[PDB]
Write a protein that binds this ligand. Structure first.
Ligand SMILES: [Cl-]
Ligand SMILES: [Cl-]
Ligand SMILES: [Cl-]
Ligand SMILES: [Cl-]
Ligand SMILES: [Cl-]
Ligand code: NA
Length: 129
């Protein structure tokens, strides 16, 4: 599923991400835009053989099991394919664990390079929330 900007904002709000660990909703929408272009089916392979999955590009090196990342962890306790669903629940719940692990949203490279320090409220401007 390719979300619209305001559609995704509303879904993330319903799932408790607005101001989660102090990150306002626009941060999460901005991250998703640059990680996946709002596409739940996005995948990208990394140099070390791990793979990033879904709307927030969660990495199989630590967070999910895809059966092809030897020596990795599965800290969200899910198959990586669950992160590609049209229902964003699994991605949101795993993202909550990631953002709580000490480094905040700096875990998302695209957030750090394209959203951090910008006017992220623009990403939810005009949306009925
Ligand atoms: Cl957009
Ligand atoms: Cl915001
Ligand atoms: Cl594995
Ligand atoms: Cl949902
Ligand atoms: Cl933080
Ligand atoms: Na893994």
């Amino acid at each position: 599923k390719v979300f619209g900007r305001c559609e995704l904002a509303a879904a993330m709000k319903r799932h408790g991400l607005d101001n989660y660990r102090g990150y306002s909703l626009g941060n999460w929408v901005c991250a998703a835009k640059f990680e996946s272009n709002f596409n739940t089916q996005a995948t990208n392979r990394n140099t070390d053989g791990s793979t990033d999955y879904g709307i927030l590009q969660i990495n199989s090196r630590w967070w999910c099991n895809d059966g092809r990342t030897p020596g990795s962890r599965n800290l969200c306790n899910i198959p990586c394919s669950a992160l590609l669903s049209s229902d964003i629940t699994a991605s949101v719940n795993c993202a909550k664990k990631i953002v709580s692990d000490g480094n905040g949203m700096n875990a998302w490279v695209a957030w750090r390079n394209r959203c951090k320090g910008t006017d992220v409220q623009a990403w939810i401007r005009g949306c009925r929330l």
